[PDB]
Design a protein around this ligand. Structure first.
Ligand SMILES: O=C(O)c1ccc(Br)cc1
Ligand SMILES: O=C(O)c1ccc(Br)cc1
Ligand SMILES: O=C(O)c1ccc(Br)cc1
Ligand SMILES: O=C(O)c1ccc(Br)cc1
Ligand SMILES: O=C(O)c1ccc(Br)cc1
Ligand SMILES: O=C(O)c1ccc(Br)cc1
Ligand SMILES: O=C(O)c1ccc(Br)cc1
Ligand SMILES: [Fe+3]
Ligand SMILES: [Fe+3]
Ligand SMILES: [Fe+3]
Ligand SMILES: [Fe+3]
Lengths: 491, 82, 305, 102, 491, 305, 82, 102
């Protein structure tokens, strides 16, 4: 007979002990552990709500992979690469480039907890977490690898995080801040709670919905399978949050969540935003970016944060306004500077798309529409020189993304600047400036790509020079309009 | 000599790096920013382009040079119409 | 810039003489944190974690120009690890089921339950130390191929822990008056036979240089556990009519040999740089006495009553 | 804003099941095991959002009956892509629930 | 260590012994065994060329099913049922009805060999064969079951073989003749060699090619997985054939193959012929029915039959002529009498299709096209009474399929009749009459559906009476034109 | 004709109180050969196989007007059978591997190889008879749910045969002078200890009535093999320091108990018709003597040395 | 009275069961067969329809009845044009 | 007929591989393991017909190398939907072949 897990589970996490040959602080140094002075004994009350055990994990994960790979195999001849809209193909290129090696980096966030968390249950669940992120990194390299032979941009599934390309710097600056660059408890709160119950549902499930509409079941099935792991290991965050609150650290916990959510938001708005409202073909847009945000971030995540005892962030209303406006400008920036991307941005401004944008964001045409009007007229006149840039955008010193605002009929743009230790920094929001001020030692001597350009690190100081510095190896790899401007024919 | 600014042009969607000269007048500075905005993402219009520190209420005189203005390199300016 | 044809595989693998395998594709050259010596991580170059990596990874005395070229001799990936271990673990769980049906625990020699309570059940602490330590080598190693071996080793250490938890609970059902599941922390903290091991692990867990961490964990501590804990337990189980423990341990020894296999491969890779011989040997000499003392104290306890 | 306020002030709890063979059995189980709750379902093709007010229980026994093959509760992880509410899981059931009422 | 299969395989089939307490003939009665008097010792040289062993079987078959089911689960929302051409849906309905419960009957063919073959290797391979056919019957019930709630015709995946519907009688008269109604050696030669290396490749791989073109990967993936089992268990036939030849029974072996191939051909022409050349949308026709015949039956199967030492069938030239002609007329019959089918036949005669038919079968328009001209004109003129029958077709006493010929400009039709024991029988070819004459005890007292109608077994003796006799339980279940005559608009 | 809506399941299951399971959907009411008493198969009503089925299925004295309602208590389908057996068989294959590594066969008591060669290796003949016989019940049973249990039982018989072949060959590597893998047919044909079993099976294999076949095989022969062959072999192995055989036999006994479980459920179904008690009891008493003699002769042989 | 035949009509694709009467002339039989063929799958044409035993060279006289013909029930006939 | 005799008179042997992860590796393996045979490939989307004249060998070792993961010869059954020629199989390779020459 076999004995049920409930009867022996406690023994698997009865692993704390009182050190005698080194000190507790030597074994769990604050800079790596992040215990905030909460004594060893208090951490033993940590109770992961989504448990598993080694024999079950290997069996269940064997099954999950068998399904993901069989589906890929059975659909290799569905002609997705050949028959898909180029906007959908660019969505795949963006996703795999932005995600695969970042998932692998997440193994280190989990390893940080597995070694340095004082909570025994956290150390075990983080061991499964290390394994889960290994899975995610490997899947999201194996899957796009077949497309290397079709298109050099898919090399970036592997190459991006090794480059200084501007979007890869943005991704790395965020993930190095919340995943690999902080103590174990910060990882539990910023990564597993904030990012992983907060935003990854958007990129993995919201995008899966659009993928299924687009008829790409290999991809939809993959990313939704990945998120089933997340749903388990993300549950390391809540009990850590609850433990900090019970031990007098609510304010610290709140600040970490406020920071992580905002940082996630800005990157999400530049990567997932344009995918959902512009690259995905109109007929495949299951919901708008804003609608998904309201389902996943407002309706689900923010409600769960309140249930666990935290408050709505101090920047709530700013966040809501950003959801209406930011990604429209981020898309415009990515598109106008498309040659610096490793995917081919779709403009997404045919009349029928502009009508959808107007319904989903009333006032769109009198704002972003005004810029797209100028762009469209230049395409129709074959003045293509006027739709490629001859300077660099100014870039946020926190998010690493261009400084933007609302264009057109009620123009409004604001940079939030800061003098600090003899240097002038510029931030794309009040919250980004605040994140800097929360932990200047984390950020102060970092130089963004424009800082580097001005410092003489990028030679020559031209478009070509920037493109070489960003790691492009051939003409094909540089982003172009997804449809070769064929959308202008509908205008 | 070279003098980088970050410039926001009226009705555009972003702030851009624009390198001007220390001894450029505000009129010359406005035209250097306009190059990267007007007829690219912003409709041309009649009127006089003026330069101001970002979101300031006061405009720099048209004939004032960058050197005379007290601006520091990499400070943010707006270019707006009278 | 020039126009180039698509590549058959990733750009970094394109010069391979033969077709890249599943292992090559999903495992190689994934730590971007080794690219910039001044800024491992994309933050302020003197951020706390950048300072940690610059000291404890980049500045290790163990040096190689191309750690990335390291290859797991077993070429395991997540998918194949789970296939293998679901096989090995389903076998062990089947052994647990059948030996329980046969009432194996009732037939062990008189007193064996006390030897198990003292010398076996507190192994959960030692195995968890290996788990924590393996995760540290994972996060610090300067190549993703090295780190992957460490991830799988971390999981194996948890596998061993879980075996021990399960059997401690199971034993206690037949022998409820032996402290099984109740007194292990006390034994680990206070019993002389465990103090050599505990001192060794507390100290090993505070060796933060990646190379020293690797050498002490995989070349000193883990081989000691095989020869001085696993095999002697199997011998004692035999003398006490415990026929399950030797089979369980044989499964765990398969994992332990796998860990030694990749470790020896890493050593061989490191020794391409002649300077590394003295470095590795020095760490071995440094850590051996603690390991020997650990083994000696454990065996004296296992041998007594 | 009123739209954001309204979205936040919900007490919806329950599983988000990814496309596959568990979607219909989970919906049916939610209905059976929570009599006198309305179960809402939002179909997004790649996933289905299944919810009730305050508390939603899925029992292993009912789920096995609706799925039509032997089933252990732990297996739900293969198809549970996300969930709303806090989770209390055990070998007999999973309960999704909130502590607070908004 | 483990010892390789080659070193212990012989012991797995060292199972023949010399009976002492009953006679060899009592243990292996000729009526069930079919050993033709070949002594037990001779059968020990039987050497199955495609071997497996129990541990490998369970492991590999576990893997095969995991893939088939995962693919089905991942594509449930691909909108196959909702979006497919109704001709494709009808192809699914016809396939599952004609195949699922027949696969389950094949378990009994395999069982007959497992018990009654004197060759030990045959008895073991047949045990895996029993298992494979169980798999196939279960997969082909499970897969269509989800469509029960969509359309009552999918009920026939289960119901067809329990009915007296005319096509079900044709299927059972064939399968009961070659699978369940003869001795073990006859099964080995007629089922595993003749049918299963000769025709099943057409229905399970030829059709899979069309399914893939149509974008129905759940189906294509399923049936190609099924045929992987066939490729193994079908290899029981060749070594039985070789043994008969070595022991002086080449003449009887040849006769069994010649019979089984013709019988399979006629059923295949009424079921697969119309699917490949009419129901499958033109754009998804990977090859014509004839082209697939020349690939699988002529190029592959017949060449294999010669390699093994048998001769081309005596009716070779009749067969080649039949491939050009027969299925066009069988199609016309199934469509005109569509109300008697459990699927909705597609007419398949829009001008674009008729161009394809002419290219693939030169002279088609001056033959079958003449009938379709009259039919088409009646549909265009709303004379629908003339596109539904008011009598029964005459039916073959062997194949159970209507007696047909070539219509139009060079009309030729021939019935081959026979008086025997006080009854007049009619056959659709010389070969069908020959088959009857080879074994009259198997066939002589069987009454085809028209014989039953004339004898008073079908009451009332009306169209409705016949339809109710055939097992239809509601108005929805009876076949209709697949497109509700929408195709005439293109004419 | 009436107009009717689509059904949630097959028309024959549509009145079920509970939702149809995978087992129900794929297993139930598949023998169309029972529909027409005068023509089981769609051929001449007096074709040879039609005459065979009318006599040996339809005319059985074992009678029930709804055999199709029989339910395998395990509700196995092909898919679940292979999941279960891949688990059990992986486990057995792993035991073989590990016991071989440990040189198990060398440590058995002197002379055990001869007892194995005489009493164990020729079991391949007995098990193949069970395989052939199970296939016969499959092809004759009057319900697909019954036939399915027999298919899986046929496969299990082959599993046992294969275990026996594998171990006969393996043992012959350590003990090449005992006739292992060489003399089994002669023993099955000529050795007194096997002759009761051989006579039983040759006669059982010629009981062509489906009911008599089922009763003799599953209610008489197979339970005798459990109690008179499998268990006594475990007891003898234990006395001779063969620790592998008892574990192997325990896995085979799981299959055997499963066969007994479905058989008992079929008996219970049959007994709904009170007339069947005497029919079944009659066949049991007819075959019991042969079974008892087979067991006696086998045990007398086994207890030699 | 009722007399079943199997009939193959000229230019059709099949043979059908047609029930005629023992006292029908061949002209009447031809019309009964044509009912199930002409304007259904066979174009109407000028000419006189005749009846013969299947594949026979000789034609039955137009006014000859089924009874006088010697035909047996369920025998095959053709209906062709002269 | 002429077309039919031409179709019958072939000596093509080799595997028919169903759509999935074994198609490209098997084609590559056929080319590598039969040097100086021309390998023909007919792509029917759901399956690919791979052939050579008279004999075609697939070795386990080459197939493992082209597949890029551990591979036992018996696993080919998962994807071998049919084949032309007689089959001679063992743990090291499969040979498809004809006895006669047409
Ligand atoms: O934790 C995660 O799951 C994660 C982290 C980073 C990226 Br990129 C994707 C996923
Ligand atoms: O593993 C060992 O024992 C060892 C490894 C490297 C060197 Br240098 C010396 C010893
Ligand atoms: O028993 C449990 O703890 C459990 C059950 C199901 C899932 Br999903 C997770 C955990
Ligand atoms: O032997 C076979 O594989 C087979 C037999 C009949 C039918 Br219907 C389908 C398949
Ligand atoms: O869900 C159910 O409860 C159910 C479904 C089908 C049938 Br038939 C009976 C019950
Ligand atoms: O299984 C048995 O042993 C048995 C079954 C039925 C009857 Br009546 C008597 C005995
Ligand atoms: O070793 C064998 O006999 C063998 C190998 C592969 C396949 Br597919 C079939 C048989
Ligand atoms: Fe992840
Ligand atoms: Fe994650
Ligand atoms: Fe089959
Ligand atoms: Fe088959």
């Amino acid at each position: 007979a076999m004995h049920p897990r409930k009867d022996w589970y406690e023994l698997t996490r009865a692993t704390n002990w009182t050190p005698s040959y080194v000190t507790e602080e030597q074994l769990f140094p604050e800079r790596m552990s992040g215990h905030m002075g909460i004594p060893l004994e208090k951490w033993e009350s940590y109770d992961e709500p989504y448990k598993t055990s080694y024999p079950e994990y290997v069996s269940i994960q064997r099954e999950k992979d068998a399904g993901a790979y069989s589906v890929k195999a059975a659909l290799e001849r569905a002609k997705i690469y050949e028959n898909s809209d180029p906007g959908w193909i660019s969505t795949l290129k963006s996703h795999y480039g932005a995600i695969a090696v970042g998932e692998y980096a997440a193994v280190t966030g989990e390893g940080r907890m597995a070694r340095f968390s004082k909570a025994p249950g956290n150390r075990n669940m983080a061991t499964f977490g290390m394994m889960d992120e290994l899975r995610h990194g490997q899947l999201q390299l194996f899957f796009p690898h077949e497309y290397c032979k079709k298109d050099r941009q898919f090399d970036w599934a592997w190459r991006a995080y090794h480059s200084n390309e501007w979007a890869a710097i943005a991704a790395k600056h965020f993930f190095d801040d919340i995943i690999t660059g902080r103590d174990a408890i910060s990882v539990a709160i910023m990564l597993t709670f904030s990012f992983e119950t907060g935003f990854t549902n958007m990129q993995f499930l919201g995008l899966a919905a659009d993928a299924a509409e687009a008829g790409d079941y290999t991809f939809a099935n993959l990313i939704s399978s990945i998120q089933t792991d997340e749903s388990r290991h993300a549950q390391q965050g809540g009990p850590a949050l609850q433990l900090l609150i019970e031990n007098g650290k609510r304010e610290e916990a709140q600040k970490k969540v406020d920071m992580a959510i905002w940082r996630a938001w800005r990157l999400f708005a530049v990567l997932t935003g344009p995918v959902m409202d512009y690259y995905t073909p109109l007929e495949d847009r299951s919901q708008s970016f804003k609608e998904f945000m309201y389902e996943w971030i407002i309706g689900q995540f923010e409600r769960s944060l309140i249930d666990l005892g935290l408050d709505k962030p101090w920047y709530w209303d700013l966040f809501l306004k950003d959801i209406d406006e930011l990604h429209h400008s981020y898309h415009m920036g990515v598109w106008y500077w498309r040659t610096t991307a490793w995917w081919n941005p779709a403009a997404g401004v045919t009349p029928e798309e502009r009508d959808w944008l107007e319904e989903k964001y009333p006032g769109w045409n009198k704002r972003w529409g005004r810029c797209w009007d100028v762009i469209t007229e230049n395409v129709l006149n074959d003045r293509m020189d006027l739709v490629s840039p001859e300077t660099l955008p100014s870039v946020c010193n926190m998010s690493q993304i261009p400084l933007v605002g609302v264009p057109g009929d009620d123009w409004n743009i604001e940079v939030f600047s800061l003098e600090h230790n003899g240097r002038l920094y510029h931030f794309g929001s009040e919250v980004d400036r605040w994140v800097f001020q929360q932990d200047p030692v984390q950020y102060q001597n970092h130089m963004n790509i424009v800082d580097r350009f001005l410092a003489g690190q990028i030679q020559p100081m031209t478009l070509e020079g920037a493109l070489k510095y960003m790691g492009f190896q051939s003409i094909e790899e540089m982003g172009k309009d997804a449809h070769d401007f064929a959308w202008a024919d509908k205008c | 000599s070279a003098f980088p600014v970050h410039a926001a042009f009226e009705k555009d969607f972003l702030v851009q790096l624009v390198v001007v000269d220390l001894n450029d007048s505000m009129d010359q500075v406005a035209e250097k920013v306009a190059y990267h905005c007007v007829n690219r993402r912003v409709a041309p219009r009649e009127g006089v382009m003026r330069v101001r520190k970002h979101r300031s209420t006061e405009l720099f005189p048209r004939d004032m040079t960058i050197a005379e203005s007290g601006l520091n390199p990499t400070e943010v300016i707006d270019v707006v119409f009278e | 810039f020039e126009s180039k044809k698509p590549m058959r595989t990733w750009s970094h693998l394109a010069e391979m003489r033969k077709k890249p395998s599943e292992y090559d594709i999903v495992s190689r050259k994934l730590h971007y944190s080794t690219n910039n010596p001044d800024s491992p991580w994309e933050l302020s170059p003197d951020s706390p974690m950048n300072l940690w990596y610059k000291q404890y990874r980049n500045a290790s005395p163990l040096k190689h120009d191309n750690w990335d070229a390291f290859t797991d001799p077993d070429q395991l990936v997540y998918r194949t690890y789970n296939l293998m271990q679901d096989g090995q673990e389903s076998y062990v769980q089947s052994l647990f089921d059948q030996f329980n049906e046969r009432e194996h625990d009732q037939m062990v020699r008189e007193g064996w339950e006390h030897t198990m309570a003292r010398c076996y059940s507190p192994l959960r602490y030692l195995f968890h130390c290996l788990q924590m330590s393996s995760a540290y080598v994972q996060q610090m190693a300067p190549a993703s191929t090295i780190s992957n071996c460490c991830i799988l080793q971390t999981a194996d250490s948890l596998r061993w822990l879980t075996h021990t938890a399960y059997r401690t609970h199971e034993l206690s059902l037949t022998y409820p008056d032996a402290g099984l599941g109740e007194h292990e922390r006390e034994l680990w903290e206070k019993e002389p036979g465990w103090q050599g091991l505990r001192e060794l692990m507390e100290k090993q867990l505070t060796a933060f240089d990646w190379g020293e961490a690797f050498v002490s964990l995989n070349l000193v501590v883990k081989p000691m556990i095989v020869e001085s804990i696993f095999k002697p337990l199997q011998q004692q189980a035999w003398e006490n009519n415990d026929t399950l423990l030797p089979l369980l341990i044989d499964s765990q020894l398969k994992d332990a040999e796998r860990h030694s296999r990749w470790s020896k491969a890493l050593v061989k890779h490191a020794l391409e740089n002649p300077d590394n011989h003295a470095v590795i040997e020095g760490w071995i000499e440094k850590w051996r006495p603690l390991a020997d003392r650990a083994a000696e104290a454990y065996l004296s306890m296992l041998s007594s009553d | 804003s009123t739209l954001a306020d309204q979205a936040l002030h919900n007490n919806n709890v329950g599983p988000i099941i990814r496309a596959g063979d568990l979607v219909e059995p989970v919906i049916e189980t939610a209905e059976i095991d929570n009599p006198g709750k309305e179960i809402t379902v939002e179909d997004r093709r790649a996933y289905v959002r299944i919810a009730a007010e305050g508390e939603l229980i899925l029992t292993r026994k009912t789920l096995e009956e609706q799925l039509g093959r032997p089933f252990n509760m732990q297996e739900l992880e293969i198809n549970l892509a996300s969930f709303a509410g806090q989770i209390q899981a055990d070998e007999d059931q999973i309960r999704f629930y909130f502590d607070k009422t908004m």
